[model samples]
Target: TCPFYKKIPGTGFTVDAFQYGVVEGCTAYFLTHFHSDHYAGLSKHFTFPVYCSEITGNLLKNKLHVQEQYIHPLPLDTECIVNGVKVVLLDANHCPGAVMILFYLPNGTVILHTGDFRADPSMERSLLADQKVHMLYLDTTYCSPEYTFPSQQEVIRFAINTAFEAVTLNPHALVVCGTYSIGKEKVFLAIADVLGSKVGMSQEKYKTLQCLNIPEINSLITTDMCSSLVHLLPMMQINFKGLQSHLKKCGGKYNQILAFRPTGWTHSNKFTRIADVIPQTKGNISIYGIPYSEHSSYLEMKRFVQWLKPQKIIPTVNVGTWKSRSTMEKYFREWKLEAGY
Candidate 1:
C-alpha cells in the first residue's frame, strides 16, 4: 500500500512529473495484497478506496474482519479504473491469494509492485514475457547468499511425515501448524492430497472461503469430521491459545503444532519445554520441523531481480538488510538504486 502521489508530501509541486489523469486526477489507493506487514499502518489512518483480488478481499474480511466502506474487488490482470488510475493485479505464487500489483498511471508510466513473489518457472516465465514494464519494485527478501528454500512439494511432504511421526508416538494427539488463512488453506489441501484425506482447517478459514464464491470449496471440513471415526480425532493447527484449550476440552487433542517460529523457543524457553514435553505430554504433544517458507530463497531472489533489470532495486525485510543488499549490489550492478526503506 505504498503511496502513489505525484506531488511530494510537503510541497505542492510534482516529484516524478508524470501526468496521470491530470484532468480527472487520481481516485483510490490500491492494496496489492493483505499481508500483515504490508497493511500494518493501513486500515487505521489511511482513508482511501482499497482494491484487491477477490481472494484477498475474502481473506481480509474473514481474518481481520475490517469493515471498510470503500473496499472493492479487482480481478487479476484486469484493469480496474476507479477515478483515473488503472490497477492490474498479478499473481504472486508465493502464497494463495497473494498478488503482485501493476499500476498503470494515467500517463502510461507503469509501476510494478511485486508483493513477495518467488522464482517459480510458471510465474517467472510470464513476468519475463511481459514487455510493458517501466519501473519494478521487486521482492528482495532473500537477496543474500545464506538463505535457502526447499520446494513447496518437499515442505508438504515434511509436514505429513512430521504428522505421522507425532501420531505414531501418541495416538491421541493434535498437530497445529499456523499460516495465513488463505495460504495455509492450500497447504492443508496439499496435505490432504498427499495423505488421501482432508487436512483439517479452522472455521475462520471456512468463513474466508465464503468470499471465494465457491461454496463447494468451503464444504471441505477440518478435523472436526474425525469425530465420527473412533480411531481418529479432530486436530487443528492454529496460533490462538484459547482455541487449543477449547479443542482439548471438547474431545480435541494436541500432539504436534507446526509453527513458523522466529527467535524465542530455541535452545531455551518454552520451545525447550515443548521439546521435552512432546515426548512426555501424557505421551502426547510432538513438534516437528518443516522448511515450508513463503519467502524466496537468497539465490532465487537475487536471480529474479537480475532478470528484471530494473533501474533500481530495493530490499525490504531481514535478508535484505545490509548484507543481502551488498550481495545483490555486487551481482546486479544494473539496479540503479538499492535501498532498505
Candidate 2:
C-alpha cells in the first residue's frame, strides 16, 4: 500500500529536493507530526519548507542525526505564514512527537488535519470543545462502527495483567511486548507495575525502566529483572513465525512467555517473512490477541468532527474500503459538508 512509492533520495552534503506533485499550486507542505507517514520525505527531499512542533524538531534531530543545514522548527499553537498559507500546530495524542495541523488559506478555507488520535476520553474530551476547526482532515482507519477500541491505559493494562498472571503461576516467566525506544515504552512500565510485588530487576533493566521516565513506572517494581525468564525483541532477523515458535517452544519447557503486539499474534500471520511486517516466529510460544489499537475509535472521530464543526472535513487516512465514499458522504450530509481535495 505504498501510495507514492519511490527509492529514498538524498544523503550527500547537498540534499535532494523532495518533489511531490499532489496539490497543484501547493505552495507549502506542512508536516503535522514526525511519524513516517507524515515526515518520511523530510530529510530525503527538500520540499516546500517543512513545519513542525518543537518536540518533533528535536525528534527528527535525534533520528536523522544530520548536522547539515535542513529544515527549521516552530513552537506549537502559534501561527506562521509560509508560501501564502497560515499554519499552526496542535497536539496530536497518538505519539510523543505527533501534532494536529491547521492550514488556513487566504481564500477563507480553513482545514484541520488531525494526525492519528485516540478516543482517550480523558485527554480528547477537553480538546474536543476548545478548538475552532473549519475543514477537518480526519484519521478514519477504524471508521467502521463495529469496533470499540480500548483506551491506551486499558490496553496496556491487559498486556500487563497477562504477563503478571504468568509470573504468579510460575516464578520463571517472560513478558515480551512490542515497543521502540521512542514509543510503546509506557506499555512496558504498565506490565512492570503489575508484577512489581513479585519480581525484581537488575541494574541494566532498572536503567531501561528509568529511561522511560514515567514516574509511576520508575518507582514501580518488576519481575525478577535479572532472571533468565525475560526477553524482548528486534533480536535476530529470522522468519518471525519461526522465531516466535522457537521462543514459544523453549518457553514452555523452562518458563512462561507472553508476547505483545498491536494486532497481537494476528500480525505475524498477516505479513510475510521478507517484509518483516510480522514478528518472525515459529508456533512455539503460546500467543494471545488483545484487541488493542492506537488510533481513535469511530465514536471518537465523530466527536472530534462535531467539536471542530469544520466547514469541510478531509480525512488524512482514508474514507473506507468498500463503502468509504458513500458512507462518508452520508455522514457529512447528516453533520456538515465533507470533502477531500
Candidate 3:
C-alpha cells in the first residue's frame, strides 16, 4: 500500500509515518520497521517522538543517527497508555522488530493496524483470537489471488538448496542472492554457515546488522565482495545491469555469475504458485523469485479479516494506484455481508 500515516480520529496517535507527499500532521508516531519506504521522510532532527520495538529503535539511531530522546521502545504483549488510548504491541512476523498495533479507543472501539506481516497462525491463536476489531488497517501488499506463494521459511530452504546445487555445478561461478538491507538475514546466514562461505555486503549493510547485536547475524556480516564464493548483494544490485557492472569490476575472478531474487513476485498465476520448484533462467543469470515475503498473501488476508470480524476495514494502500485494490476491497466487503457482520 501507499506508505500510511494517519491521525486516529479522536486519539492523538499517528500510525506509520511514510509517503512524504501524502502525510501531513501527527502528535505521536508508531514506526513499524526500518525499511526506507516505511520511514521515507524521517530524519534524526525530526522533533516528533517515535514509538517502536527496541530493535527498530536501535536501527533508527544507528542507521539514520536519530537521537535517542525521540525514540520510545514499546514492549511486546503489554498494554501502554498513549494519550487517552490503551495500546498493545504484538509481533508482526514481518521483519526484525516489526509490530501489529492494537489500539483500544476511549469509545470501546478496537483498531488493529498490522504494519506489515505474514500469515502467522500462532499470532492469531494467541494474541488476536476471540477479539472483535472495530477497524482494521490492513497491509494489502499482495491482496490478490493471482499473487500467491509458499511460506517464507519454505522459500528460504529452497533458496539455500538452490544455491548449493548451483555452486556444485559451477565451481568457478559467483553465486549472488538478492536481499534487502534489513530482512533476509536468515537466508544470508544460512548460505554462509551451510556452504562454509562468507557473505559480501556493503559497509552500510554491515553496520546496520552490527547495530542489531543479533548473535546469528553478527557472525556472517562482511564488506569484502570476494571473501566468499556466494555474495549477498542488495536486492536492487542483483539484477542483470547490476551484475554486468559487477563483472566489469571483478577482473575475471569469477568465470560465471548466477543471480537469484528471493521474492514472492516470481509467482504470478496458479500453476507456478503451487509448483514444487519455481526458478527461471535468463541469459547467463538464474532468477529464483522465492516467495520469501513479509506481507500476507490473498488467502491469508481473507482468513485474517474473517477471524477478526471487524466492523469496517480501511486498506492501507491507496485505491487508485493499486491494480488489485478494487477486487480485494470488493472481496472483503462481500465477506462482511455474507458473514452477516
Candidate 4:
C-alpha cells in the first residue's frame, strides 16, 4: 500500500513532505506549506534537498533552522524539472506561499497533489486543472457533510465588519483578533486596514510577518500590552478563562474586551450559527467566534472532484488509516475505484 508517500511505479519521486522509507532512495522532495504535521518526522534530520514555494522556504530556514543549500525555492506558476519530471507549482489559496504541486510524468501522465487548499472557481478553469489529470492526491480535511462553513473571503468581510461594529457598540472594549501562529494573517491585515491602525503582535509573530513582507498587512511590533486598541494574539490565548485572566491582569486599563476567533469549527453539525455579534461574556470580556477557515467544506470538495474527474483519487491526509478510507468512501461513493492506472 502506498500510504503517506505516493510514488511513481518505477521512479523514486515522491510528493509533499512524506519521508517514511530510505532517505537515500528519494529522488526529490516537495513541500506544499510550512505546517508542522507535514514535516513531522524528518524536519530536523533531512539530508536530501527539499523544493517548495519561496515563502515556505523562508519559513523553513527561519523557523525550522534548516540549512539554506538544502532548501530550493520554487516560484508559483512556473514550470521546472525535478529529477527529469516536469513539475509546476500553483497557488493553493490556503495560506501565504502554499501551493498545489502538478507533476507531468515521463509516460504522459499528469498527477496533481493538492497539499492543502480551498476550492476556487477561477482555479477550476486555469490551465493547470483544465488538462487531463490522471491521478489526484486530494486534501480531504473536511470530506463530510458536517463541514459547511462559508468561504474565507465571505467570512473575512463578516469578521472585519463585526469587529468595527463591536468597537462602535463598546467604545471602551479592546478588540482582539485571535489566530494561529502562521495562518490567518488575512484576518489580522483586514482588521488593521479597516481600523486604520497598527495591530500589535509578539516578537515571534513580528518576525514571521516581517519575513513575509506582505504589502497589504500593516502591523506594529509591541509587547507593551496597552499601546494598541486591537491585539492579534494566538488563538490558544483568547479562550474564556484565558481572556478572563488577561483582563484581570489588565488592571482596569480597559473597561471591557472583545475577542474574535476566525475558524471553521466555530459552527458545525454539533452547533448552530449565532448572530454576527453573539457575545459570550466572561467577567468584563466578550468573545465572538466567527466562521473563517482556509480548508474546503464538503460541498466544495465534491464540486472540485466532480469537475476534475481524475482516474484515481487518493486522500492525502491520514494516509493508510481506516478513517481516511472510510471518509473517502462516504463522500465519493460513486467515483471510479482506485486501481493500477
Candidate 5:
C-alpha cells in the first residue's frame, strides 16, 4: 500500500497514486499493476496520463473502465521517454500484468519500484546484470525472517496433489479454491486440468480473466455453479461457514468441501518444520493453508537485494511503525554491505 500522497523524488511521476489530486510535480501517474492496493485511488473519471504495461492496460479498460485517452500502455523491455524521464517496464512475476517499474532520472540514477514480486534465481540471471540500481522501492510484505515460503512450483504441486487425493477418496467432495481476480491462476488451472473438472467463477471474474488470453480458459470456465467441480471464490469464502452456505445451495450434491487457502502468510514460523504446508480440518470441511504467495519471501528479498546491490532500500509495505521498519532496515543494512553498498 502507498501513502495518501507519494511522489517519486527528482521526477514528475507518482507511482500508484489513488485518492489523489493533481500535484505540482506530477507530470505522469504510473500504475505498476492492477492490484486493488496499488490502484485503490483510481476511478473512471481519473483523467491523468496513466502509464502501465499492455496487460494492465486491458484490465483498466475492461475492469475499471478508465478512459482510453488517459491510458498509455508501455511496451515491455522498451525505453520510452515521458517528459524526458526515461522509463522501462520489466515483468514483476506477481501476476499477468504485474511489472517492476524502472526509471532513469535526469541525473542518471536508476530507481526500481517492485510493486509486488516473487524473486527467483532465474530473474537475476538476465535482469540488472550490468546496470546497478541506485534506489529500490521494495515490496516488504514478507520482509521479516520469520516469514518464508516454498517455490511456486513446489507449492502449486502440493496443492494440486492435495486436492487430487481428497477428491479421489470421495468424488462427491467439492473443491473451493481460494483466489482473487488474479493470483494463484496456475494453481487452480493445473488442478482443474489434472482432475478434469468444471470451474465455476463469477461472470465478471471470468470476463476479466479472459483478457489474459489463456488458451485453456474457454474450455474450463463455467458460470453455472451447480455442475462446477471446483468453485473459485474469494479467500475469505474458503471457510467452514462459507462452505456450508455454498453447500446449502447444492442440496446435498456434494458430501464434503475441500478448501485450498493459498497464500504466503499461511506458511510461517509457527508451523512445524517437517510440514511445508499446513492442512487442517474441522468436521466435514477441510482447509489446506498452502504457501502460494506472489510476493517474495524473507530469503528471497535478501537474495534479491544482495544481487541487485541498490544504494538505498525503501520499504513500500511496512513503512509505518519504527519497530517493524527497523527490523527490515536491519536486514537491508546487512545485505547492503554484502552487496557492496
Candidate 6:
C-alpha cells in the first residue's frame, strides 16, 4: 500500500521518493537502495540531494550518471544529521546494497522505513533495543496471508538442488536464472558456487555486480557466454517464448535449458506445501519458478511488527488505491492488538 504519503509521518524527510522530485514538504530525499521502484524518479538532473549507501552511490554514478555533488553516500550503522534530523542506516539483508532507514526527529520520535527487506534477527541485542520506535513505514510487499513463503536460506537450497538435479540428470543442460538490476543475487550466486561454475551475464550487469563487492561473485562473472553453462538473464524475458528464442540464437549450444524465475508472485499459500509454486513443464526446455523473494513474507511481517512494536503503522507498497490501503490496515490493527498497544 502506498500510504498516500510523500514524506515520513513526522519529518521533513522522504525515504525512496526521488520520483516526486522535492515533493511538497520534503527537505531532504533519503533513498533506501538502488531498486527501480524506490529510485524511480532519480536521474542526473535531479536537483535535491539524495542520501544512500556507498555502493548504491557508486551505482548512481556509474549506471545513471548522477553527478557527484548531488549524491550523499552515508556509511552503514552510522548516524548523520541531515539539516538537524538524525538518521541512520542498517543492512536490509534483502539485496546487495539495500538498507533499512531509521530517522530520529528532533522531538524524540523515531520513524523506521524498511525500503524493501527480508526480516533478520538483528533486533535482539543492542542494534535496535535501546530506543522506542514511533512510526514504522514497513515494506509490506507481502503483507497478505496468501504470500507466506519460506526463509531465504531454504529457497536458496531448493533452487540450488533443483539446478543440481537437472544438471546431474543431463550433463549438457544450460542453466540460467532471471534477475533484476539489483536483487536476487543470492539465489544465482549460490547456484554458481554449488555447481562449481561461472555465470555469463551482460557487461552492464557485471559492472553492477562488481559494485556490490561480494568477494565470491567477482571471479564468477564472465562476459563470454561459453565460459560456463550458467547464465544470468533479464527477469521478464526468462519465459517460454524468450527461452525458446535463446536456443535458436545459440544454435543448440547445450542439450537442454533449465530456467529459474526467482520471484514471489508465483507463490500461493492455498496448498500446504510451498513447493506447489513451481508448475510442471514439458520438452527440452523447462521454466521453473522458485519463490525466492527479496520482500519479507506475511509471517515475517507479523514477527517484525511484533518485535519493533511501533506506535504507528503505515505500509510502503501496494497502497495505490483506497481499498488496498483499507485491506492492509486491518492486518495492522490485528498485529498491534497482540502487542497490547
Best by lDDT: 5
Per-residue accuracy of model 4 over 1-341 as CA lDDT, tens digit each: 23444554445666654546454467777788877667554555566778899998888888777888889898778789887778889988887888998888888888888989988777886666558998888998877777777667777787788778877787667778886656777776777667766788777877787767476444444455567777877789888787777667667777777788876654442465434336678677777777777888787877788778787787876556787778677656554333212
Better TM-score candidate (1, 5)? 5
Model 5 bad stretches (over 4 Å):
1-5, 267-270, 273-278
Candidate 4 ranges with C-alpha deviation above 4 Å: 1-10, 18-24, 42-45, 216-225, 249-251, 266-277, 318-324, 335-341
What's the C-alpha lDDT at position 111 in model 4?
A: 85
lDDT of 2 by residue, 227-284 (tens): 4344444323123563456455553544445665555223333333212322233333
N/CA/C clash count, model 1: 7
Q: Model 1, residue 106: displacement in angstroms?
A: 4.7
Residue lDDT tens for model 6, 227-275? 7788888988787788877767666678688898876755354564555
Per-residue lDDT of candidate 5, residues 110-220 (tens digit): 888888888877778554665878988889988888786667887777778888898899999988888875767887788877788778888877888877756767888
Candidate No. with top TM-score: 5
Alpha-carbon local distance difference test for all models: 0.50, 0.52, 0.74, 0.74, 0.81, 0.79
**Tens digits of per-residue lDDT for model 1 on 167-192?**
46665544444454344444455444
TM-score (all chains, Cα) for each model: 0.67, 0.67, 0.88, 0.88, 0.93, 0.92
Q: Which ten residues in a row have the lowest lDDT in candidate 4?
A: 332-341
Candidate 2 vs candidate 4: the TM-score winner is 4
- Per-residue lDDT, model 6, residue 145, is 85
Residue-level lDDT tens digits of model 3 in 1-341: 32333556667677776444334555677888887867877777777778999899998888888898988898999889976678888988887888889988898888888888886667777557757788888887777777677777677777778778777887777777777757766777776666788788778777887866577664566787776776767788877788878777777887677776766555354665434665566566666666667778788877777777888777775455655677767888877887777
Off by over 4 Å in 3: 1-5, 18-25, 251-253, 267-269, 273-284, 321-325, 337-340
Could you tell me which residue pairs clash in candidate 3? none
Which pairs clash (backbone N, Cα, C closer than 3 Å) in model 1?
174-254, 174-255, 176-237, 176-257, 177-237, 255-286, 311-336
lDDT value for model 1: 0.50
Decide which is better by TM-score, 4 or 5: 5
For candidate 3, give the lDDT of residue 118.
80
The lDDT ranking, best first, is: 5, 6, 3, 4, 2, 1
- Report how far residue 314 has shifted in candidate 6, in Å: 1.6
